[PDB]
Every structure is written in structure tokens, then in C-alpha cells.
Design a protein around this ligand. Structure first.
Ligand SMILES: Fc1ccccc1NCc1cc[nH]n1
Length: 284
């Protein structure tokens, strides 16, 4: 029995190493990672890898690892796949904890945009969770936190984190994590997976996939939103991704909206994440 070494970047930025039999399916590796993390509420999470383009791909738990990574290194990341719309309803604090770590990276990366005040408030709850009660002894008027809070740090943002941290005295890690999530869940890009595409006229749009449905970002105005119930059918052909939308009441025939993706793999990736998110919606 020949086994392949796997390396997984965890959400704290540490590396987990294990071996699986070389013909193992994704689920085998994912189960080992989740046992390592003491994670029971595993359905919200997954593993990603980077292809030659260094584009992120979900490791399909049902398929052989070798037929996915193909020529690439057995190097993965552990990530939230399905962002819970209501994190208070998760059964375990440790689940909310990993979700916070993911969202912290979502924020620092700029995938999840955030006002100055929300950056500072989220940051204050992270500090309360990580270090406990505000201590003047560690924080001078010149203090800069080890914690990454934002895509671009300023002294103003560090000061506001400290100001808000002072107000959280006596808050436990689980409580601070729950407040963090109550705020983060409201942000317009929470749990939105964005894909580059062109509309049928060749105009650059972004397609967002999330729990509630599909978003077509055409410009700062004209954001079209199709709740999952409004989406009849989706499919990809060559570089094209198509969504069929239910007609309005007493209208004949659904509408088709077509999109051009960069290449066939990008169309297939978008199709698969939409199918997977739509099933998630069907279970809610
Ligand atoms: F309702 C949706 C449908 C499809 C994709 C996303 C959403 N987000 C919630 C919302 C409702 C109104 N504006 N934002």
C-alpha cells in the first residue's frame, strides 16, 4: 500500500502533514484534517488546491485526489465552503471559531470589503477572543497589534480597535466570536464567491454565488439578484455558462442569461460551485 504525503494549510496559517493511500478520495484526507481540528460540523468546510494557473479549486471529496491535483503537488488549504447564513445556529463553538478564522482572512485579503468602523469592531472582537480583557500594560499610545485586521492597516484603525476592545471587558472567546459573526454575516459580500465573466454583449461583469442565490454585478448600479427559487436550470458548454430564470407569474417561457468565462475550466468551476450552493439552499 503506497501512500502520498499531503500538506494542508490550516486557517491559523499552520501546516498539517499526513499520508493517504495514493488512490484515496478527497473525503479520506478531509476526514483526517477535521479529526485533527476536532471539527464535527464538517459539512460547511472543504479543501482547496492551486492548479498551474494558481487558481483555487475545491477538492471533490467523492473523487480520487490524484485525478484532481493531476501534475501538481499534494498541497491543500482548509477553507469554509458554505458560509452559514445564521452562524448562531451552528451547534458548536469550535465551528464558529474556524468560521471566524476564515472570515479574518476574507477581510485581510479584501474578498470581504468592510467599512473602517466594521474593520475596527471585528478586529476588537478578535483581540478580545485572542488576548482577553484590555490591558493598558501591553498597549501604549503607539501600539500596533500583531493581528491583521484589514487589507491596509493605519494607525487610526489600530486606535479604534483598542477603543472598542476596552468596551468588551469580561467577554469570553465564544461570546466575542459570536459578536464577530453577528456583524460579519451582515456584510454585502459575506459568503459571496466571485467569478470574472462577460455578459452576452462582451461587457466584463462579476458573478457572485452564495446561499441566497446568484448575483450579476454589472456596475455599482444594476446589481441583478436571482434568489435560488428564480433559477430554473444552469449549464456550461465550451467557455459559456447559462442560467435559466423562471418567468414572472402569467408569463410564458423562462429567460436564458448567457455568460462568457475565460476558458472551459473556469465555466465548469462556476457551474459546479453553483450546483453545490443550490443543493445547500434546498436543505435550508
Ligand atoms: F436575495 C438575494 C438573492 C440572490 C443573491 C443574493 C441575495 N442577497 C440578499 C439580498 C436581498 C436583497 N438584496 N440583497
Amino acid at each position: 500500500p503506497k501512500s502520498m504525503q499531503c500538506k494542508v494549510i490550516l486557517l491559523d496559517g499552520s501546516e498539517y502533514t499526513c499520508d493517504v493511500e495514493k488512490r484515496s478520495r478527497g473525503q479520506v484526507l478531509f476526514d483526517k484534517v477535521c479529526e485533527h481540528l476536532n471539527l464535527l460540523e464538517k459539512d460547511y468546510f472543504g479543501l482547496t488546491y492551486r492548479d498551474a494557473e494558481n487558481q483555487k479549486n475545491w477538492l471533490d471529496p467523492a473523487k480520487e485526489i490524484k485525478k484532481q491535483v493531476r501534475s501538481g503537488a499534494w498541497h491543500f488549504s482548509f477553507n469554509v465552503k458554505f458560509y452559514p447564513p445564521d452562524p448562531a445556529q451552528l451547534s458548536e463553538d469550535i465551528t464558529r471559531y474556524y468560521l471566524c478564522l476564515q472570515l479574518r482572512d476574507d477581510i485581510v485579503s479584501g474578498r470581504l470589503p468592510c467599512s473602517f468602523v466594521t474593520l475596527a469592531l471585528l478586529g476588537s472582537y478578535t483581540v478580545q477572543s485572542e488576548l482577553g480583557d484590555y490591558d493598558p500594560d501591553e498597549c501604549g499610545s503607539d501600539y500596533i497589534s500583531e493581528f491583521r485586521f484589514a487589507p491596509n492597516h493605519t494607525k487610526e484603525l489600530e486606535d479604534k480597535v483598542i477603543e472598542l476592545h476596552k468596551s468588551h471587558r469580561g467577554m469570553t472567546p465564544a461570546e466575542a466570536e459570536m459578536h464577530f459573526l453577528e456583524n460579519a454575516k451582515k456584510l454585502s459580500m459575506y459568503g459571496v464567491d466571485l467569478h470574472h465573466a462577460k455578459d452576452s454583449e462582451g461587457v466584463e461583469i462579476m458573478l457572485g454565488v452564495c446561499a441566497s442565490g446568484l448575483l450579476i454585478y454589472r456596475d455599482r448600479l444594476r446589481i441583478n439578484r436571482f434568489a435560488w427559487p428564480k433559477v430554473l436550470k444552469i449549464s456550461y458548454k465550451r467557455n459559456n455558462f447559462y442560467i435559466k430564470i423562471r418567468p414572472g407569474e402569467f408569463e410564458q417561457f423562462e429567460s436564458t442569461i448567457g455568460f462568457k468565462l475565460p476558458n472551459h475550466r473556469a465555466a465548469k468551476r462556476l457551474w459546479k460551485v453553483c450546483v453545490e450552493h443550490h443543493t445547500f439552499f434546498r436543505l435550508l
